[PDB]
């Protein structure tokens, strides 16, 4: 089975062919960093920064979203959402929509899942995620989010672009711990807690647009 | 109405007379400790602790714990709670069964609900909890529980006695911090989180009898 209607059959090839898969689109210092040689970054407390994705992965990703087109979001009330409303509104196209929710819950239950068990001893991870969706913020359209807490007890945060290169401007800006994320990396992500220990706060991108894929896992 | 059916029951007036509950209940320096001039501890990072009620109170629970007789508890199964089985069984008794649990429930709304908006920024809460019990811990009876997690957003602690001269042993050791709490106050109370980035075990109690509160508060 290899589903020909769509731009990169590869990219959802993990059930089929996992190996193969995690070989082409894993970062190249995953398994290194976790095996525990280092590699992994906690710039600010109760934080880390370890290499999750590759170029190719993000690559397909990017194409992929920008083939989707409809970007969707910005509005206070929400569609997606049982509520109908939603506190922070951002420019974003759901996983959901592209059908790569249950490739994306599988990736983050085989690898991801196994980077929290060995960061964070004694705590047991099911992978469980509600909301999974990448943000594309532009000088004009979407502006850097208020301050806002993370209503999941553990944030993963990836990056889609190259700092500079792709956009110009800084990342994040942690409040309680006056620690800004100003040197975003393409191929690594960062995964720490925002419930109550974390009011998280986005910096502003001057020149072009950032692209950021991040998921609210264990809510 | 005053009901005389209690050994103190002025403890069950937390209603009738706000003012004189908290006058003759509260710890002085509660106040000031709200107010916003220091008092409040952080021994180890995303941990608090502050005092919280007044000997008086304190011993008034301790004789209606004392008088209440069942102090069940020490099975890995359980009949109170729904699921019926518990990870780390514990000498102790529920508010339930003494009554007060209402009263608890009203005095954290009252009290506790503040401190943590003022202690944590951006944090909503509304004094929401289900696991609430006093545990008794003496070396010939029930011993040092293992490290575990708390299934709670955060978790209380209140001393009921005063350390050495009512019993001898020790704290909590923070395992991912390396932070041992070696003189806990019988007025203080220790709020921190129990979820994620915090895993305790607390020290073995060698002589006396160690009475400590536990509530689970928002779970």
Redesign the interface.
Same mark, same amino acid.
């Given at each position: 089975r290899y589903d020909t209607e769509h731009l990169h059959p590869d990219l959802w090839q993990i059930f089929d062919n996992p190996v193969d898969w995690k070989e082409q689109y894993i970062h190249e210092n995953y398994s290194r960093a976790l095996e525990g040689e280092g590699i992994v970054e906690q710039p600010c *407390?109760?934080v880390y920064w370890f290499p999750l994705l590759s170029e190719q992965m993000c690559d397909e990703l990017v194409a992929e979203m920008e083939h989707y087109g409809q970007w969707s979001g910005g509005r206070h009330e929400d569609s997606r959402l049982a509520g109908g409303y939603e506190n922070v509104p951002t420019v974003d196209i759901h996983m959901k929509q592209v059908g790569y929710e249950d490739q994306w819950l599988q990736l983050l239950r085989t690898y991801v899942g196994p980077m929290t068990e060995s960061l964070? *001893?004694?705590?047991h991870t099911k992978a469980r995620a509600v909301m999974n969706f990448v943000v594309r913020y532009r000088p004009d359209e979407q502006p850097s989010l208020r301050?806002?807490?993370d209503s999941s007890?553990?944030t993963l945060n990836v990056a889609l672009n190259h700092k500079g290169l792709d956009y110009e401007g800084g990342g994040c800006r942690f409040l309680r711990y006056d620690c800004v994320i100003s040197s975003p990396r393409k191929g690594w992500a960062l995964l720490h807690?925002g419930?109550?220990?974390h009011?998280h706060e986005g910096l502003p991108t001057t020149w072009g647009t950032r692209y950021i894929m991040v998921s609210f896992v264990d809510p």
């Open positions: *407390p109760d964070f *001893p004694g705590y301050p806002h807490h007890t553990f807690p419930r109550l220990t009011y």
